[PDB]
Amino acid sequence: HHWGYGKHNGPEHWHKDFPIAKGERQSPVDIDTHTAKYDPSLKPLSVSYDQATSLRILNLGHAFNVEFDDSQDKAVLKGGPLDGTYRLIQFHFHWGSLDGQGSEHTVDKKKYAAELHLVHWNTKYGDFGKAVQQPDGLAVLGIFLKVGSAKPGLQKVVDVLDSIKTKGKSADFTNFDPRGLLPESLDYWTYPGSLTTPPLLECVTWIVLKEPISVSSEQVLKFRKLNFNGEGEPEELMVDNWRPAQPLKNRQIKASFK
Ligand SMILES: [Zn+2]
């Protein structure tokens, strides 16, 4: 018995086991485009994924993760509001049961069908485990997905989902290029936040891209065929694995554009 997205263990219940859920810098948040402040000090994002090495895709019960080799600076994120080098460790998605919901962050209260999270950790802290204990330990790149035309670079992920339908299943997933998931523009908003799943640590510097990337209804449909449960257990479709927007409180959202 643990946390999930059901009516008995959903986000509204998380605070009982993880008190930080009611913290001062929780994520996600609603991005108000008119209150967001343009900051000329912000440098362009530097995404170096040319040497990225994917290893495995895994169903972790609350979503599926596509893991990368982070033993060296193969795939890194620099620039933007960041100071230092952050290594890509995984990426995953959150999606809904309907096309009108699924994203965690919202833009002027607008919800997207899904949201992609590329997680990177600050190399100065050695390893992911130590990084999550620091205020500038992680740097998550968030990308919105809207339903429209299909995304060629996502199909490879879509095709292997059948092999990791239930919790605990994993499959080799090599030579996947994450560059195929990026929109044309790298304009972004940024704010200090947390991990949107337990244990909800406030160690994150969020970089949410303004431009969404389109996926077809067929591609999103296959996401909805995954199961929260493990094999041999009652089937529960993996849908609506998103946390609602949290209070912004004493925080300012900055934009790299105007
Ligand atoms: Zn996420």
Domains of the chain plus CATH, in order, are: 1-258 (3.10.200.10)
CA of 71 to the centre of ligand 1 (A): 22
Q: How far apart are CA 186 and CA 252, in angstroms?
A: 20
Do 20 and 200 contact (CB within 8 A), yes or no? yes
Query: Does the annotation list 94 as a binding residue?
Result: yes
Residue 192's DSSP bridge partners are: 205
Q: Does the annotation place 106 within a ligand binding site?
A: no
How far lies 254's CA from each of 71, 155, 251, in Å? 32, 33, 10
What does DSSP assign to residue 219?
A: H
Distance 72 CA to ligand 1 centre (A): 23
Which residue in 30, 76, 40, 4 sits closest to 227, CA to CA? 4
13, 62, 105, 120: which is the annotated catalytic residue? Answer: 62
Q: Is 2 annotated as a binding residue?
A: no
**Residue 92 CA to ligand 1 centre (angstroms):** 6
Q: How far apart are CA 128 and CA 135, in angstroms?
A: 13
DSSP string, 77-135: EEETT--S-EEEEEEEEEE-SSTT---SSEETTB--SEEEEEEEEEGGGSSHHHHTTST
Q: How many CA atoms lie within 13 A of 175 on its CB side?
A: 0
SS3 (DSSP) at 57: strand
Query: What is the whole-number distance in angstroms between the Cα of residue 51 and the centre of ligand 1?
Result: 23
47/74 Cα distance (integer angstroms): 11
The answer to whether 117 is annotated as binding is yes
Helix (H, G, I), strand (E, B) or coil at 54: strand
- Which structure tokens are listed for 157? 């992920």
Q: Per the structure block, which two tokens stand in for 166?
A: 């239930």
Report the chain's C-alpha Rg in angstroms. Answer: 17
What does the alpha-carbon distance between residue 41 and residue 43 come to, in Å, rounded to a whole number?
A: 6
* C-beta of residue 73 within 8 angstroms of C-beta of residue 85: yes
Strands 213-215 and 141-147: parallel
Resolution of this model in Å is 1.8
Give me the sign of the Cα torsion angle 4, 9, 13, 19.
negative
Neighbours of 126 (CB within 10 A): 10
CB 144 within 8 Å of CB 120: no
Token pair for 142: 């968030």
- 196 labelled ligand-binding: yes
> What separation in Å is there between the alpha carbon of 203 and the centre of ligand 1?
14
Asked if 2 is an active-site residue, the reply is no
CB-CB neighbours of 22 under 10 Å: 12
Alpha-carbon torsion 139, 95, 115, 213, what sign? Answer: positive
